[PDB]
Amino acid sequence: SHMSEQLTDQVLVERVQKGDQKAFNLLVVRYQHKVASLVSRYVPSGDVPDVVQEAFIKAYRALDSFRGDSAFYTWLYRIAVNTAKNYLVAQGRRPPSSDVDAIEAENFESGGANLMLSEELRQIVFRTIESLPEDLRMAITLRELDGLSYEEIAAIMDCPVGTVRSRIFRAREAIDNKVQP
Amino acid sequence: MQKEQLSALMDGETLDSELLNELAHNPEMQKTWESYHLIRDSMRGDTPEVLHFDISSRVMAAIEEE
């Protein structure tokens, strides 16, 4: 849903390449759920955090080599996919007795043998969006779902770019109030 | 820095280095960056089935040691 967003990534990536770890943190926060979503298509849920972690570390280490030949997100996703797939290969080379163990370790033995559902969050977000005034709904919709820049949104809603900026902000603030608890 | 400026920054609509700096050094702005990106991911359907909220902290802790 963007390209101008790529602009921010490039600026952040340039700083990380110079040694700025704070800038990397911003990128990780930006890409953490997207990367998890991608990784979760390939590995078992129990392994998703470890694979996501390894993907980000691999990306950080290889960042000297990102020349901006392609968009940073694409470069990062390829790394995450490869990281995930390698995990699947390792798992698919399990011995005979690894499945037998899983089977015998599965059932609880007498005696003794951070999380949220994304659909839950999505319901909250969309319910809030549906309750916003038309002006805010359209603004954040055009920006986040269609990927349109403020200039494009301005022409579409026939309003100043300053007004687009403010409308998107207020939509976000409204949603955050119901989400960020 | 105002949150409205943070909102513009995450949209690529300003690339001001002073703002990027303030963001990197302001805990409250960091929370907003995180929250607004969660909202974006939710809206775009860019989430796994189960969200984990400790990813970035785990990553950075691993970066600090290398």
**CATH code where residue A94 lies:** 1.10.1740.10
**Please, which residues bridge with residue B51 across strands?**
A116
Q: Are residues A81 and A122 in the same domain?
A: no
Q: What is the dihedral of CA A34, A36, A40, A44, to 10 degrees?
A: 180
Structure method: X-ray
Could you tell me which CATH number the domain at B1-66 has?
1.10.10.880
- B47: tokens are 């989430």
Q: Can you give the three-state secondary structure of chain A, one letter per residue?
A: CCCHHHHHHHHHHHHHHCCCHHHHHHHHHHHHHHHHHHHCCCCCHHHHHHHHHHHHHHHHHHHHHCCCCCCHHHHHHHHHHHHHHHHHHHHCCCCCHHHHHHHHHHCCCCCCCCEEEHHHHHHHHHHHHHHCCHHHHHHHHHHHCCCCCHHHHHHHCCCCHHHHHHHHHHHHHHHHHHHCC
Q: Which residue of B7, B48, B64 is in closest CB contact with A48?
A: B48
B37 DSSP 8-state letter: H
Using left for φ > 0, alpha for ψ between -120 and 50, and beta otherwise, residue B14 falls in beta
Number of domains in chain A: 2
Q: Which residue of chain A has the CA closest to B23? A: A26
- A96: tokens are 């005979």
The H or E element that residue B30 is part of is: helix B27-44
Spell out which residues of chain A touch residue B16, defining contact as CB-CB under 8 Å: none
Task: List all residues of chain A from 133 to 172 with a beta carbon under 8 Å from chain B.
Answer: 140, 143-145, 149-150, 165-166, 168-169, 172
Collapsing DSSP to helix, strand or coil, B23 comes out as: helix
Q: Which domain holds residue A90?
A: 1-114
Q: Which residue of chain B has the CA closest to A151? A: B13
Please check whether residue A28 touches B, CB under 8 A.
Answer: yes
Q: Are residues A97 and A160 in the same domain?
A: no
B49 DSSP 8-state letter: S
Collapsing DSSP to helix, strand or coil, B50 comes out as: strand
Q: State the resolution, in angstroms.
A: 2.0
